[PDB]
Amino acid sequence: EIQLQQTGPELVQPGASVKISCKASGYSFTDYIMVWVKQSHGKGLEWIGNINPYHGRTAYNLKFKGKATLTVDKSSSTAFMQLNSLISEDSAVFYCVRKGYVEGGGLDYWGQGTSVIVS
């Protein structure tokens, strides 16, 4: 079983920045890319960007460029993402999901998600 433990819920004041995380387990961490998604309230999902945990490589959706930064820490198998310049519209649920690039190309396992409230 693959496991994606994300950090807990956050309430943040506008203008500042949160830094959610997501611990993986159930497979070798560096084998697959970690992708992040914004599930705004009562709507469809939005891709934010992926990161190769091996070399730290990164690629972002442009609508979220400059807002979210993806990082990784191999020794503790955790992928963290940071959001800055937070505002009312950033209020949403953020998931981390694993993507098997060399396995068959699917975002197989998602984490439960993190609820960030900006207010």
Partner: protein, 113 residues
């Protein structure tokens, strides 16, 4: 980027009937005979669940009443026969080019007595 469009946005089908969910890509997502279209299911208060990858591959553990077909820019997800636990929202997602993108989603409702 390749935009995905799902039609319709809401659908109501009777138990035992066939539900067909469409997904249109703005550009082809094929490569080497392999369509990079995935389908996910999302029930309220839950993270999305993978149903089919690469257009037509059913992920293990997923009931065989679900099937996916299509190539190029036209894709459909079929559920036949539809059951009650199939009430949920379904999203398509392509992985051909960057950025990776999802369709708007289609909410399926079951018609009963």
């Amino acid at each position: 980027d390749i935009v995905l469009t799902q039609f319709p946005g809401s659908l109501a089908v009777s138990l035992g009937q066939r539900a067909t969910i469409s997904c249109k890509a703005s550009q082809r997502v094929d490569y080497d005979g392999v369509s990079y279209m995935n389908w996910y299911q999302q029930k309220p208060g839950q993270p999305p669940k993978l149903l089919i990858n690469a257009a037509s591959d059913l992920e293990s553990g997923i009931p065989a009443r679900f099937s996916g077909t299509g190539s190029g820019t036209d894709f459909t997800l079929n559920i036949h026969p539809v059951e009650e636990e199939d009430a949920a929202t379904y999203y398509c997602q392509q992985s051909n080019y960057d950025p990776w993108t999802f369709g708007g989603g289609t909410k399926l409702e079951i018609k009963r007595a």
